[PDB]
Amino acid sequence: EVKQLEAEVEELESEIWHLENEVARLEKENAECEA
Amino acid sequence: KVKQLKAKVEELKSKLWHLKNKVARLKKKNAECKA
């Protein structure tokens, strides 16, 4: 049970990290185009 | 314990969902800015 939940937490954190990277990049692109 | 992990999973799920909506919002803003 803990082995399963512990794994889901790792899966969720990795998806988050990639989205956070994508957000930062998109905010940059938006900054330029807006300027 | 198993309860704490459960709490982290729910917090991560909520954060992930927020990020997906943010990324989708930034993609549309950028597409429109690029007119």
B31 Cβ under 8 Å from any chain A Cβ: no
What residues make up the domain containing A25? Answer: 1-35
A19 contacts B17 by C-beta, under 8 angstroms: no
Q: Which domain holds residue B9?
A: 1-35
Q: Do B33 and A16 touch (CB under 8 A)?
A: no
CB contact under 8 A, B30 and A33: yes
**Residue B35 identity (one-letter amino acid):** A
Q: How many domains does chain B have?
A: 1
Long-range (24+ apart) CB contacts under 8 A made by B12-17 are B12/A9, B12/A12, B12/A13, B12/A16, B13/A12, B15/A16, B16/A12, B16/A15, B16/A16, B16/A19
This entry's atomic model was obtained through: X-ray
> In Å, what resolution does this model reach?
2.1
Whether residue B25 lies within 8 A of chain A, CB to CB, comes out as no
User: Total structural domains in chain A?
Assistant: 1
Collect all residues of chain A within an 8 Å Cβ-Cβ radius of residue B25.
none
